[PDB]
Structure 1
Amino acid sequence: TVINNWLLIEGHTIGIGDSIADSKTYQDIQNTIKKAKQDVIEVIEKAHNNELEPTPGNTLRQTFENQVNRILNDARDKTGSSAQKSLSEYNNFKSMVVSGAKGSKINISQVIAVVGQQNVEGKRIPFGFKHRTLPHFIKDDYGP
């Protein structure tokens, strides 16, 4: 009763301004994504030239998948952390997350910075078509 009645004086909301980050934050996120895509391309080129060596206990496909998966995971959480640092104290997403009322830090990162890797049965999207995930790509394309 007491907190609900005080909230009429305080009030609490959520809006577009709570999901907006400054231009510097967007530029940092885009730079992180460009770096991640570039190093994924380098890993792909190492794999194509037979320069990538398999780790103990994993085949070469598993080694490549582990490398690119950890790459995209660290890129995603770095972008999410940078977006979290950009949050103001009046930001309502942060107010609802720090209180534990609803949501999580991953929700803020996905709303603001990067939704991240989409996984099916614990792997990246499989080649439903002939060596393709969709008709809009070229065959044997393991890019993000």
Structure 2
Amino acid sequence: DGPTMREITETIAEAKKKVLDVTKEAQANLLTAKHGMTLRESFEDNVVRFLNEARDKAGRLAEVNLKDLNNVKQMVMAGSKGSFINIAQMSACVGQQSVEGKRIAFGFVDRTLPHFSKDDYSPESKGFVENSYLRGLTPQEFFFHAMGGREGLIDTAVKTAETGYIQR
């Protein structure tokens, strides 16, 4: 729905504002860590909760809005194929990509790609993919989601091999 989309897009806009305060807050040195956890580790743990909480609300939003005759929903309800995360990412938002448990890292000096300026910890700069699949990814998103994806292709081959040796 057009109305669902606007609600999804605000859902997402609010999370980016939460992020923006937590940012300004750490930027002024006002933020506290708590107990053996670094300031920057605190900051990241908080922005990633924010961004995940957004992805999720956005996706609950889309689920609700689809009707019983929605055939994706009809599969999920039966149990035969698909789950919430799939609705969500197709229809509402794909969300934060990650490599080794963390937001996309600065592999250029102080930046994730040359299209950004230095010291950028914002959602977009570190791998939040705001768009759904339907809508399409931007180029930067596209590349961070492939980073993501590659890590599971790798992790998958390592799993399969580790698992088989265990099993024997």
- TM (norm. structure 1) is 0.83
Partner of 1:125: 104
CA deviation vs aligned residue, 1:85-124 (integer Å, no higher than 9, x gap): 1010000110111112111110001000000110111111
Matches within 5 A, 1:50-65: 50-65=29-44
Distance 1:85 1:47 in 2: 36
The answer to whether the aligner puts 1:139 opposite 2:139 as a matched pair is no
Whichever residue aligns with residue 76 of structure 2, its letter is: V
Aligned partner (choices 28, 43, 49) of residue 7 of structure 2: 28
Structure 1: segments with no counterpart, 5+ residues: 1-21
Moved over 6 A (4+): none
Partner of 1:73: 52
Partner of 2:134: none
Partner of 1:42: 21
- How many pairs were matched up? 123
Distance 1:142 1:63 in 2: 13
Q: Which has the larger radius of gyration?
A: 1
Whichever residue aligns with residue 102 of structure 2, its letter is: K
Distance 1:97 1:132 in 2: 40
The answer to whether the aligner puts 1:99 opposite 2:78 as a matched pair is yes
Distance 2:84 2:122 in 1: 27
- 1:66 counterpart SS class: helix
Aligned partner (choices 68, 72, 93) of residue 89 of structure 1: 68
Identity, in percent, stands at 54
RMSD: 0.7
- TM (norm. structure 2) is 0.72
Structure 2: segments with no counterpart, 5+ residues: 124-168
Higher helix share: 2
Whichever residue aligns with residue 113 of structure 1, its letter is: A
- Tell me the CA shift for residue 57 of structure 1: 2.2
- 1:140 counterpart SS class: coil
CA deviation vs aligned residue, 1:43-78 (integer Å, no higher than 9, x gap): 110001001111122110110011101101111111
Ranked by relative contact order (alpha carbons within 8 Å, sequence separation 6 or more), the top structure is 1
Distance 1:31 1:141 in 2: 22
